[PDB]
Amino acid sequence: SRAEDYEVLYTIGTGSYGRCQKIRRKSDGKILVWKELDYGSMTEAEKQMLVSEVNLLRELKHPNIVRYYDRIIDRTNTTLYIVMEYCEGGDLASVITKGTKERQYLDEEFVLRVMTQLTLALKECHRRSLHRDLKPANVFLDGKQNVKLGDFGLARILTSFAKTFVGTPYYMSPEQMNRMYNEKSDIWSLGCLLYELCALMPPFTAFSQKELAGKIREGKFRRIPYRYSDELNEIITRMLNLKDYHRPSVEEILENPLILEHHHHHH
């Protein structure tokens, strides 16, 4: 819990609220990341919210959720560093982009790993209920074929106008579009992600929000590519049902004959 306990190796990327940097823990040489948060402009009330939210982050321990390790205050630069597990495989948005550029669809086995492991991450989120975001850019891969749901973003729970505005809400469920808790809405979002992993495009595309909402409400989309099994297409399609009560529960997903031990985590 001191900055001097770690050495920054390099900046992985700049997020909406600060840099994510690869770091090395001096005690044992463990490779981790930290995320920078500038709290200099925050009120006491906002900082109190931040404290409560960091503590909730610390409570989520699951093989399929990016692990929280530490928090560091650099009072001199009013910077809070949140230390977390490093995921060497990077994010799924990059995986999708790679598939598109290299003109190569992803293995069904990979899609099954994501479905299995993210469903389990969601199961844990539901048990604890908690902001979560299933977009590909927030799902990560380690070096052992494990899939981890990334942190929501402390500042994000708290720039937030910029991308809440500009961005297109590809994964928003029909019911959340009418009015924002519903665990079946997470299943819809999972369906969108899995669909995009298969098709390399989301199930509903549009250039405007109005157009997108129209498509979402109609609930129609192309079949995922034919290289993917009818069984996989079936389950993704069920997750994209207009009726929340027709979408499979976490339990129903995991009972699917597609899902086997090897699709789960192995550390």
**Which positions are catalytic?**
133
Residues facing 25 on adjacent strands? 6
- Amino acid present at 145: Q
Residue with tokens 């093989």, as numbered in its chain? 63
Q: Which conformational region is residue 225 in: left (phi greater than 0), alpha (psi within -120 to 50 degrees), or beta?
A: beta
Tell me how far CA of residue 253 lies from CA of 156, 212, 239, 265, in angstroms.
30, 27, 9, 16
For 216-253, b/e burial (b = at least 16 CB within 10 A) is beeeebeebeeebeeebbebbbbbbbeebeebbebeeb
Length of the chain: 267
If binding is defined by CB under 6 A, does position 91 make contact with ligand ADP? yes
Cβ 70 to ligand ADP shortest distance, Å = 13
- Segment 116 to 155, residues that bind Mg ion, using CB under 5 A: 153
| Distance set, CA 147 to CA 78, 150, 180, 205, 236 (Å) | 33, 10, 28, 26, 18
36 binding partner (options Mg ion, ligand ADP, none; Cβ < 5 to 8 Å by kind): none
Quote the radius of gyration of the chain (alpha carbons, Å). 19
Which range in 83-91, 213-221, 231-239, 243-251 contacts ligand ADP by CB under 6 A? Answer: 83-91
Query: Minimal distance in Å, beta carbon 155 to ligand ADP?
Result: 8
**d(Cα 22, Cα 167) in Å, to the nearest integer?**
27
Q: Is 73 annotated as a binding residue?
A: no
Interface with ligand ADP, residue 142, by CB under 6 A:
no
Query: Judged by CB, which is closer to Mg ion: 149, or 232?
Result: 149
* 136 contributes a contact to ligand ADP by CB under 6 A: no
Shortest distance (Å) from residue 126 CB to ligand ADP: 22
**153-172 positions binding Mg ion, by CB under 5 A:** 153
Nearest approach in angstroms of CB 146 to ligand ADP is: 12
Q: Which of 34, 68, 81, 86 binds ligand ADP (CB under 6 A)?
A: 86
Check the annotation: does 14 bind a ligand: yes
3-class state of residue 223 by DSSP: coil
Based on CB atoms, which residue is closest to ligand ADP, 72 or 254?
A: 72
Regarding 87 and contact with ligand ADP (CB under 6 A), the answer is yes
State the binding partner of 86 from Mg ion, ligand ADP, none, CB within 5 to 8 A by kind.
ligand ADP
Contact pick of 132, 136, 153, 265 for ligand ADP (by CB under 6 A): 153
Nearer to Mg ion, 149 or 197 (CB): 149
Q: Is 20 annotated in some ligand binding site?
A: yes
- Give the number of other CB atoms < 10 A from CB of residue 14: 11
Of residues 139 and 190, the one with the C-beta less far from ligand ADP: 139
